[PDB]
Paper text:
Cytochrome bc1 is a multi-subunit protein complex embedded in the inner mitochondrial membrane as part of the mitochondrial electron transport chain.
X-ray crystallographic structures were obtained of bovine cytochrome bc1 co-crystallized with CK-2-67, RKA066, and WDH-1U-4 in the resolution range of 3.3–3.5 Å. For all three analogues, the 4(1H)-quinolone head group is placed in the hydrophilic region between His201 and Asp228 and forms edge-to-face aromatic interaction with Phe220. Amongst all the compounds tested, CK-2-67 and RKA066 has the strongest bovine bc1 inhibition at 0.1 µM (90% and 81%, respectively) compared to WDH-1U-4 (7%).
Numbering used by the authors:
A (entry chain I): 33 to 78
B (entry chain F): 11 to 109
C (entry chain H): 13 to 77
D (entry chain A): 2 to 446
E (entry chain D): 2 to 240
F (entry chain C): 1 to 379
G (entry chain E): 1 to 196
H (entry chain B): 22 to 229, 235 to 439
Amino acid sequence: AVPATSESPVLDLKRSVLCRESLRGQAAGRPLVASVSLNVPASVRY
Amino acid sequence: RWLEGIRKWYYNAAGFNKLGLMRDDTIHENDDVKEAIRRLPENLYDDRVFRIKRALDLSMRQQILPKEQWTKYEEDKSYLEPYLKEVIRERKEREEWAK
Amino acid sequence: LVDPLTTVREQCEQLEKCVKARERLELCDERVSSRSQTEEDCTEELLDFLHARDHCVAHKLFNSL
Amino acid sequence: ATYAQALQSVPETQVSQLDNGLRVASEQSSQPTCTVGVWIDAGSRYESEKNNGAGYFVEHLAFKGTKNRPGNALEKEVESMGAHLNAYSTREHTAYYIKALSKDLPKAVELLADIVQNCSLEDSQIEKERDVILQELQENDTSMRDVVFNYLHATAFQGTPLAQSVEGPSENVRKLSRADLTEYLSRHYKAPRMVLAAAGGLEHRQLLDLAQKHFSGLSGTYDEETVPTLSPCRFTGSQICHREDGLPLAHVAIAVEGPGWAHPDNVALQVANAIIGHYDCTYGGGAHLSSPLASIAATNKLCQSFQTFNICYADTGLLGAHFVCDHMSIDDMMFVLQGQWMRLCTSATESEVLRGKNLLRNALVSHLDGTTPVCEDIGRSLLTYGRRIPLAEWESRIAEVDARVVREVCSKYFYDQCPAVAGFGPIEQLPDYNRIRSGMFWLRF
Amino acid sequence: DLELHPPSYPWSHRGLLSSLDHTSIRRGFQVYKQVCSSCHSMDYVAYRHLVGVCYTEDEAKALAEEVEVQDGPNEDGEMFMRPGKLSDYFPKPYPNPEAARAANNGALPPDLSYIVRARHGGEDYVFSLLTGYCEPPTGVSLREGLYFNPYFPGQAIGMAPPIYNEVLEFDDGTPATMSQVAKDVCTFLRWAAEPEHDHRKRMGLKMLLMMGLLLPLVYAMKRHKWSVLKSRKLAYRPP
Amino acid sequence: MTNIRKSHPLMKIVNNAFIDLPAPSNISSWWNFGSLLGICLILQILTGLFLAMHYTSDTTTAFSSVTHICRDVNYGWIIRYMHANGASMFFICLYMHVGRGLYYGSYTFLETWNIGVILLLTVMATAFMGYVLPWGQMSFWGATVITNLLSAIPYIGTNLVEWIWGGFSVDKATLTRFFAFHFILPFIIMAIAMVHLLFLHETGSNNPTGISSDVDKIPFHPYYTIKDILGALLLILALMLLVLFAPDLLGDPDNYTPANPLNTPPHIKPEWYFLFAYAILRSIPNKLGGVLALAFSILILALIPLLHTSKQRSMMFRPLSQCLFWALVADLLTLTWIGGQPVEHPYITIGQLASVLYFLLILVLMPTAGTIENKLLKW
Amino acid sequence: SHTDIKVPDFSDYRRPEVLDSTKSSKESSEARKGFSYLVTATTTVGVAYAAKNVVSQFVSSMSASADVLAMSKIEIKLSDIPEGKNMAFKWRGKPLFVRHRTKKEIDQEAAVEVSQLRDPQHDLERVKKPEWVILIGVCTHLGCVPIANAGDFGGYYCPCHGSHYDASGRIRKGPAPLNLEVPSYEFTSDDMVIVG
Amino acid sequence: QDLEFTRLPNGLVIASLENYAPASRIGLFIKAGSRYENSNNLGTSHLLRLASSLTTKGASSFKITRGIEAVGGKLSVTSTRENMAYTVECLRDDVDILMEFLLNVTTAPEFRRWEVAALQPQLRIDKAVALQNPQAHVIENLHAAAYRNALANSLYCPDYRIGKVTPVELHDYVQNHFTSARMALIGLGVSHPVLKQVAEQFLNIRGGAKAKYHGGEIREQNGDSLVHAALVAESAAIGSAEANAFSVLQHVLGAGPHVKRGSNATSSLYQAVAKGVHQPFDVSAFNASYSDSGLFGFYTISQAASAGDVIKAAYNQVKTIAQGNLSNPDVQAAKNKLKAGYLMSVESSEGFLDEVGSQALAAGSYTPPSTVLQQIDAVADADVINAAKKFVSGRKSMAASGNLGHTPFIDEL
Amino acid sequence: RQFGHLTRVRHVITYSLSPFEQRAFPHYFSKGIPNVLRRTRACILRVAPPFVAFYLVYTWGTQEFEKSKRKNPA
Amino acid sequence: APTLTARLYSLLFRRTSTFALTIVVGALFFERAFDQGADAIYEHINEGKLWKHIKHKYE
Ligand SMILES: Cc1c(-c2ccc(Cc3ccc(OC(F)(F)F)cc3)cc2)[nH]c2ccccc2c1=O
């Protein structure tokens, strides 16, 4: 129904990490999930 | 030596410096020049791209830079020489080999 | 019947540029008409005169028509 | 047991006010969990050039200790009660809030109050958060979406405070003293500019009380001389074209000037935007997608992604689209997108407007799910509209829009109007402004 | 062979937007009629051409009726002679060039249709020739019937001074001085050679006005479109 | 896709050649001349076709049919004078066009350039045969003199001339065939001009700096569509100023007395745009020598690229060259003047000097100028 | 940062309507567009005017010239054709017949049994004045010229294939399919007929 | 209104809270995750997830898209290792249109050769995008390293198999895994009576190995200047009491940020690591738990050159928890965090649907939140030290990605 | 070659205004006049000399032709 | 009230269809106005000279 939070372009250079303040919240904690949709950009979760 | 009088004169009369161009920006591109340009590092390419972009945009407006901004005769480093010299030196060699 | 043309040709004739040119006319008039055995003529001097006369005539004649 | 009905018995929002003028807003349900916090009419639009990104600087400092809880005391205490403490700054709105056990609402509201009012802003903590912003600024440089949008603003509202980025220029980050921060704070963080909003299991009455208990010291005294007012912001039809052929994909962002928060036209525009829609290469839809922009982009690999937006500021906004595409496709993306604006403007169908309606109905109903979205809707609505608009009101404005409205409204903003364009990356193909501008009308209409 | 070029007389039609004086043409026509028609021809002008220019339809019909012209055959196979219509051209003096030479001592009188156009100097030149006839300069003996005119090439012409005072009475009663007679006939010989003159100049003025409108308009359209690029500022912001 | 502009086999071609074509940002007014030449060509063809609806190529009727156009055909005059001043405007546009090419070194685009040389030659052939069709004095006598030059050629020369003529003199056949050639050639010009652009669009345009422009290209539409309209508008002002205020200015009076194989006009000379090469012919005393000089005075154009010595492409940054070029221009203006004068003193000498100066500038001085300039940059 | 990019000052270039940075451009949007499109629209009206004239002339050229118009009509003095006589003229390179019909011939063509005619065209449907019948001297069969006052109907007779015509110029006998052609004419007075 | 629950004779669960909201979420949950792929059809379930909206018997591919979109609806398909979840959302008045679609997609896909062929490249795109998150590399690797079968299966189809998943495999997979005995149909904003009746009439479909933990390591050498690394031992299975112990141990040690831009002053691991090494880094306890098995450990993100120090530091912190250092205040914090986390996770009507349906498969019925918090309280400090003890002495699985030149091997640790 | 495949360019920003936000003739005479003069000076000593020379060769030659066609006083 | 150029825009120039109808109408009027007005300018400049002026003397 709603568009996703970070849209998904393939072939598009990655966003950088240059401090602890951006890193924390990255370390994985639960197993993987994958959703695909009709509307909403496809994403991968812990 | 003593012709350096004319050189400095010719330079200012020629007048490409008024567009912030350096001498090698003005070199007409044949195949040797193309290769030499192709062999320039990021820094030197990007500068050339800019200086021309700058100059062409000035050409379109029918203007020149402020005199402070003009390429000073002495500050005109001959950036393309090393690359071009070798591009040519190389070609002359394969030409020789074809006999 | 007076022609305005011959009026103005007179009027113009009394100007320094004209009077000097007809003097040029008259010198050779009584140089060739005085000398004999001389095939040289004097159109050139008449034309000098007419050029300067008729320039002036032009400037003023059409007024009368 | 119908939809029309369902709307009717959604919990109402409680609206109250303190002496100083702090508004207190609440929506309640039988809920073990809640969210509460402070929304403030403060951001970059309120900053000058000399103190730009102060609001952002503070955001870094906000959770770093208070006078009552110095250093990591505030952190530890939120952590140990299982609470989640969070913040955000836009060009118009700051917001700090806390996700908590319903039972811990009191301490929740105490803590929020400790952050806003009695913020330490330690010398060394400033100098540490100084480097951090600089590095965040650097990471942000490698986000093309981020950059293109910053640029759209910068060129759209050039020579105003809306042209300003939230984060501030690096020059400021490097130079902003602790003096500048405390001055910014006292000038902008005032009770009539602020709203305390909460959702979950909480009797409204309790919140209002608690508001009094901890937010009573908040000042509402702008002397006549220095009353922060938002001068309108002039939009300019313009282009900013940062060409960097070295990057793999082109970002383009193009907008006309939108009406801004207040205006009812926003509703019909949202309908129209939903028609045109959004896309990326991960979508199931393909050719069969409903939106012609989406189906055409999909079938012909024009772009990797796109969204329509309609960003609202005070009395202005950015209504447009952003797309990310191959360096060869910028022309074809721009042509179909502008094509679409014209088709709605001139010749929208009923069925497709019905679709737009249904999308937007669905959109904002399922958005407001769980306490944080709802808490925020309260907090922000109070700042933007001066009130929470009930869902049933949204639905009344939505039912109102037909084909005729979508045509008229879209024509007002899109048809034969100057856009602002930002492109970033290998944009050598990205069409010339004159060509883009001529693409805003049909010589057939 | 020196050369004296004519001076540039301030004609009623000299200027950019100046028409021919049509009353002058009507007189000048008559100076062809009564004087040159005998010697010269004017093949490209017919009786009709005068209508709406110097003569009414009916006047021009009468002028046409006043002349003989051959027509035929009739069914018997004979060429007869008849009164002119508007559709008849101004009729030639002789049957051919050779016959015309016989009549004028070897000289062929040029057709006058285009004479203003076909001689450097135009009406200035013809007017100077007609009024410039003079006695030779001293030193000069022209041959037989080779009269002296200072404006003719080689300075010797085989045409007797054709105009003099009162060589005709004008329809409108203008005092027929030699100069006036030459002015008028030149005005007509202008129109002979270039009937478009007036219409052309009308178009001139309307063109100058339209261009006056469109040139700055279109220039502004150009500057408008181009202003996107003209204004633009560049920045090289290398990493 | 849906851009029919890019899709449709026919529209694709127009889109690529007139709309989305990358043109340099900075091209000057000297680049307008291509467009303007096109317009001149269409202009000639329309006016030409309309004149041909009323003209006849029989020697007896020919002169009369043209005057018939100018007297009795509705607006025949404005059509005829437009066609004749249009031929002038063609040559002005051509010479400015070629001038641009020389100064800015556009001739480096060799196929484009040579096709240009062919185009030039063809328009010359067209305009030569055009001026004959009225069948006035200068038409007829001009045509006799020039054509005849071919007789200078050893052996075959004299035959070839009578073969062009179709008889022992410029008469019936000559005109009737000159009508046909004159009619068909513009169409061939049309074709060759398309080949001209076919080559152009492989590289796209040069620009005044002479420096490659792919860093600052703009689409032809709207920038150059708007400029062309403006250009064309200024072209139409030039044309109509001649046609409506001075139609006879650029031609010759003798072309208003019919062609007479007896009476020879005082100073026979072709129309102004040949006068420079007419003078070059008259420099050289020997006839075959003067034919080969007049031949070389045009074909030398196809030599210009080989003679190029500068390391820089354009003359913009090249002062000596600029001067020699402006010399060469003024010299050409002198040859034009000299060509219109009688073959007498002092014009004979001036001419000789001018003709020497012409070939000297192209073959020797301007190449040298190039190398000096170079040595002065330490090129 | 990219956040250090600020857009240059365009004030020098701007319209005064949009110089005021704290006001909405949306006021002047109606107007600024108006001024610009007016220039466009005005220009088009100018060029319309021109193209009309240029096209109009070129089309005119192909319409009949002054000389073709001058052989368009013919002026025939009626008082020069006596009663009973057929006078022929030359018109459009064709013989043109103008006949003074007598009191007798008027009554005779009016009484003509019309349903016997190969080509009807009643007399009063072929004339303006009954004493005058104007016809082209071109026989409708194979284009010969009929001779006045011969044949079975005392009108015209064409010797080529035996075409007999009456005093209204109607076909009555022979192979001719149509009546002799009636030209466009008018009487400009009691004396004058203008054919053409 | 509170939750209703049904288990038909055919094995199928229906659970549904009618809450009279304006929106209706329905979810069909199926034991059809990646784990039920064998070594022959690896990647089939991934194609199957991309494959909704492909023609069905009752609706065209066009109709599924256009129809759902018409009403503002949404259809999504989510996969873990153990289940797949087909979810429809819509305004409440259109549940039976979306329900028609849901049934068609799951009970009667046609999987036509041309459609299925056409869709293959989506595997590359989908996977490609997904693997942009480095956490996805490491977790997929981790499972591969730790298991010999089933739970080792990547969720994303292996490269070799792209272009090669057949119609027949898709049919086989649905026919053998999408069965009444394997499915739970969950709902908000819908009456239980008519869900039951739908499930009886349309979801009555006839029915159809243990995951052996192995312990290995897998190391992607790739030269980023950050090294992602995860170290785990076998944890307890979901549904067991011991599993609650692990959840608590996770939250003692530290499992995610609470305050934005915060220092995580209560996170035991974060602090353990922050003392050793100062430059950009992050660490969390990693806790997975499945029907057969579980993995518990930690995930580091460290500078390439400090990966050694960070992993060792982190492991050491677990060792002192396992030795015995653990005060009630810490375990109280951990429980409060966990308790708060659980309630918050089921706060949205979205997360709730995931819990209801999630439990419905892996256990008998719905456990109310109140019972669950009680079960977290039921964890003794004793059980937490056992969880840590189990981890330190358990056989290890490891996975790393980055410039691994200073990343230790398992045997190096 | 089509827009999109012309050349490689890196790190160049271009700011520009819509034609409807700006004027066609900013500082048209104020700036125009001096720029024309600058331009005129810059080329005059390269362009003008040859035409001066033409003027001279021309006016000399013309009246030399006239003079030589007069009679000589001897 | 917004300005006159603005009135012109919203009434005549926004819809391309009205823009074109405007052009054709305006051209019709421009045509006659300009023809009539410019002819005046020509005929005054050439007072008494034109057949149109001296017509009356022979009728
Ligand atoms: C193509 C091009 C032009 C350019 C050339 C001509 C015209 C007017 C014109 C002439 C002949 C025509 O006949 C045709 F093609 F239709 F069959 C049509 C139109 C207009 C423009 N001008 C340029 C200017 C600068 C750089 C490039 C070009 C160019 O490529």
